[PDB]
Ligand binder design. Structure first.
Ligand SMILES: Nc1ncnc2c1ncn2[C@@H]1O[C@H](COP(=O)(O)OP(=O)(O)O)[C@@H](O)[C@H]1O
Ligand SMILES: [Mg+2]
Lengths: 498, 366
């Protein structure tokens, strides 16, 4: 079954394919459980596929704030941020002075340390055999280390790896030729744990239920602590960091997609997207671990609309760079469907007599009231002595008003008409406001009562010294407009002693 | 041009732009002025006033839904326009909300301030409950609006509140927070200060719920720990919240919990329906809409369904609607109304105000 809500159409995924993600699957399951326990939607930016084993080792720290030095995508330092930025990706290598200064200033400001780089056996096997990023290790008998070169970046630079034991673990320390001499290779490390920084779990967005939106970022700080607590890494080796760096003037699909979203479990139920609307995994690619994989801006827009429709929203107190491109990303484009549908329903649901002054002709007064096209009926009724209709619109309701009906409108009792209304020309009406005894108003506002879906209309009655001025709006005409018109006519009549 | 929508809440101001599905600004309806009148800023609004409470005398100019101090209210509106929304009021038609049964002198003063102080090109005053009904996609029904300082039952016929049938209950969220502080203090803890009131408000909003059968739930709480929840206080200590989870919102149904001799929200709902025409009562019973922050408790719609069913004729079709966004439905309903083409006909223009004066609000807004 196809999903449809207003202009949102989601076709069912026929034969879903597995999507490679950089975040270890063990951590995807942790985040899926956090989204359920905390009743929130969490989105995490892609983690580079090649950094998976570094994160899975749980040996390293992760990229904190105020680190503008670039990571490397080659050699034994792949996945790490080298202190010497000539070892970083191509963009840093062509801007050495700028990036070397960022690396040194991160250390000088206490936001990083210069750390040694140790790799585990899994990593040496990945770089040599899985990715073929390094040439096979060759023992250099004079140093006791293994020489290798990169198969990308600068292929003329030899690297030297040494078998070392660091806290009962058999690791490989990376060395290089610094000014022609063997030296330990340095990477940017966390200032508290002193461990090298890998990529972190950078939050793309967090969407909360209403019972978490408002004045009382504290909530996001609390959620980040729950995430790090559930990830269970050693203190100092956190994958999620408090705060966030600038939005940056950059783009590239690999930076924001494929994003991993984690949602409360009710989304996976057969009534996940509504009542008989289907499960979220029918329309979005969800893996075995509960990760909802968002691969492009159109899918991100569709997922965000589904979340907003389910009453999960990004907080006002939080700052996000949620967008990248623009397939309907503005506030007007992402309005909740409950808001738009209610607006549509409300718009639909809302729709012998004495001689008059200036000569003669009470019909002219009715013509005046009827001129602007807002009213369907109008009347001037004498209420003193024997009540009678002085003038009214022919073939409508007010023309048939009786003395008994006038008696109810002007009567001493101001509460019996609240039992079940009153009538005007036989038409049943409910009393909305009784200001008949309020100085400067002397009016009553009513609304007709009808059956099934037949339209109902607002009515105002204003009392002068000798008359009642009555007006009935057309369908959709607001009671305030009719009351104002009736008041103005009554004021004119009062000025002429009527 | 975009219309502005300002919901003048007894506890919180919710403000923003018509056409948006959420307010941009939510802040306390508080004004602080220096305690010493002798020699940075002559006044503070919202969170800033609360933080400088040691320096200022704090006033709540809309404490029970009705504005009582116009000088403080003008500071709140000035703060809303210039500091929160960052707009020039003279460029925007402005929809203001008002409490049910707002006195005539008050809505005239609100109209005079918008036109003479802020120079808005147009304005309208709508009853808060009516806007919540519109946010639920309805024009007829009965709204139970429970906010910070006041609760009302407001029956509405085709967009028009019926004032003869409105019921007011002088208890809402503020009273529930104070009651929770009192019953936790009864256990030997101490929750009395402003900072402690914020802890207890957080406990209330996170852990409280409405029991389906209060006496049965009390018996369950005294026989087992199944309903207990643990809460970590700012100092690191842990407090167990047990029967207080449901005794706190029980006050809405039993106001005698706080020494009030008023009927409960289910009884005032019935009373309000019965004050309306016989012909509308079935429509009100089938359209009970809950709104306001104090209707957020889990279990409240099921409890209202049970209570109203026990009161009404057994054949009566009863329905309770409690939207997920009910904490902001008054604002949302205002955004809906002010974004419709029909609203251009409803607003009071500066030309109409110059002709008729403040009493134009009686004629145009109801
Ligand atoms: N999740 C919740 N559970 C219980 N009470 C809540 C919840 N969220 C907000 N409240 C309470 O609702 C009140 C604010 O509601 P609101 O409708 O904005 O009031 P007002 O319009 O009178 O300013 C406060 O007392 C607040 O503690
Ligand atoms: Mg309110």
């Amino acid at each position: 079954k196809t999903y449809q809500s207003r202009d949102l159409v989601l076709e069912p995924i026929q034969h879903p394919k597995s999507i490679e993600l950089g975040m270890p699957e063990v951590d995807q399951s942790v985040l899926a459980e956090v989204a359920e326990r905390e009743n929130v939607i969490i989105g995490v930016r892609p983690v580079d596929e090649k950094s998976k084993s570094l994160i899975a080792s749980k040996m390293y720290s992760s990229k904190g704030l105020f680190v503008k030095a670039k990571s490397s995508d080659w050699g034994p330092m792949s996945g790490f941020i080298p202190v010497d930025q000539s070892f970083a990706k191509a963009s840093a290598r062509r801007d050495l002075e700028k990036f070397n200064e960022y690396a040194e200033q991160s250390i000088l400001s206490g936001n990083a340390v210069s750390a040694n780089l140790y790799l585990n056996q899994v990593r040496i096997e990945e770089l040599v055999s899985k990715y073929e990023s390094l040439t096979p290790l060759e023992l250099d008998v004079d140093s006791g280390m293994y020489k290798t070169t990169a198969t990308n970046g600068d292929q003329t630079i030899p690297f030297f790896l040494n078998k070392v034991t660091v806290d009962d673990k058999e690791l490989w320390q990376v060395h290089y030729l610094r000014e022609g001499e063997l030296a330990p290779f340095k990477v940017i490390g966390d200032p508290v744990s002193k461990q090298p920084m890998t990529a972190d779990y950078d939050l793309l967005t967090v969407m909360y239920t209403y019972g978490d939106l408002g004045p009382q970022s504290d909530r996001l700080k609390e959620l980040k602590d729950v995430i790090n607590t559930s990830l269970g890494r050693t203190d100092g080796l956190e994958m999620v960091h408090h705060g966030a760096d600038d939005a940056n003037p950059y783009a590239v699909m690999a930076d924001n997609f494929p994003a991993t979203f984690f949602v409360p479990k009710h989304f996976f139920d057969d009534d996940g997207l509504g009542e008989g609307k289907g499960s979220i995994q029918t329309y979005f690619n969800v893996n075995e671990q509960g990760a909802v994989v968002i691969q492009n801006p159109q899918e991100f827009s569709n997922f965000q609309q589904v979340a907003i429709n389910a009453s999960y929203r990004a907080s006002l107190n939080d700052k996000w760079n949620s967008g990248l491109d623009s397939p309907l990303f503005t506030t007007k484009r992402k309005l909740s469907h409950d808001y738009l549908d209610a607006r549509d329903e409300v718009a639909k649901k809302l729709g012998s007599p004495p001689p008059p002054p200036g000569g003669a002709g009470w019909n002219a007064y009715i013509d005046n009231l009827m001129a602007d096209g807002t009213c369907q009926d109008a009347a001037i009724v004498g209420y003193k002595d024997s009540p009678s209709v002085w003038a009214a619109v022919p073939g409508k309701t007010f023309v048939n008003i009786t003395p008994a009906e006038v008696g109810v409108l002007v009567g001493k009792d101001r509460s019996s008409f609240y039992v079940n209304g009153l009538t005007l020309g036989g038409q049943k009406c409910s009393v909305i406001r009784d200001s008949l005894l309020q100085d400067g108003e002397f009016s009553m506002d009513l609304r007709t009562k009808s059956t099934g879906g037949a339209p109902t209309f607002n009515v105002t009655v204003t009392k002068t010294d000798k008359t009642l001025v009555l007006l009935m709006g057309k369908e959709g005409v607001h009671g305030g407009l009719i009351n104002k018109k009736c008041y103005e006519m009554a004021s004119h009549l009062r000025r002429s002693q009527y | 041009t975009t219309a502005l929508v300002c919901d003048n809440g007894s506890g919180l101001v919710k403000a923003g732009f018509a056409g948006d599905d959420a307010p941009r600004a939510v802040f306390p309806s508080i004004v602080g002025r220096p305690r010493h009148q002798g020699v940075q800023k002559d006044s503070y609004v919202g969170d800033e006033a609360q933080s400088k409470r040691g320096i200022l005398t704090l006033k709540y100019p809309i404490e029970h839904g009705i504005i009582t101090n116009w000088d403080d209210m003008e500071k709140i509106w000035h703060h809303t326009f210039y500091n929160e929304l960052r707009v020039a009021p003279e460029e925007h038609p402005t929809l203001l909300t008002e409490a049910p049964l707002n006195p005539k002198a008050n809505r005239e003063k609100m109209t005079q301030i918008m036109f003479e102080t802020f120079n808005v090109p147009a304005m309208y005053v709508a009853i808060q409950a009516v806007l919540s009904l519109y946010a639920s996609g309805r024009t007829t029904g009965i709204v139970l609006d429970s906010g910070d300082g006041v609760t009302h039952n407001v029956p509405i016929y085709e967009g028009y509140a019926l004032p003869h049938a409105i019921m007011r209950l002088d208890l809402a969220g503020r009273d529930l927070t104070d009651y929770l502080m009192k019953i936790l203090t009864e256990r030997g803890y101490s929750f009395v200060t402003t900072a402690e009131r914020e802890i207890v408000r957080d406990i209330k909003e996170k852990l409280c719920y409405v029991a389906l059968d209060f006496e049965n739930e009390m018996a369950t709480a005294a026989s087992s720990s199944s309903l207990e929840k643990s809460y970590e206080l700012p100092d690191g200590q842990v407090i167990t919240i047990g029967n207080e989870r449901f005794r706190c919102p029980e006050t809405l149904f039993q106001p005698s919990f706080i020494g009030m001799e008023s009927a409960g929200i289910h009884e005032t709902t019935y009373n309000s329906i019965m004050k309306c025409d016989i012909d509308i009562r079935k429509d009100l019973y089938a359209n009970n809409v809950m709104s306001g922050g104090t209707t957020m408790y889990p279990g409240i719609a099921d409890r209202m369904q049970k209570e109203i069913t026990a009161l009404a004729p057994s054949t009566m079709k009863i329905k309770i609607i409690a939207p997920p966004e009910r904490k902001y439905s008054v604002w949302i309903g205002g955004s809906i109304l002010a974004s419709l083409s029909t609203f251009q006909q409803m607003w009071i223009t500066k030309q109409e105000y110059d002709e008729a004066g403040p009493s134009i609000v009686h004629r145009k807004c109801f």
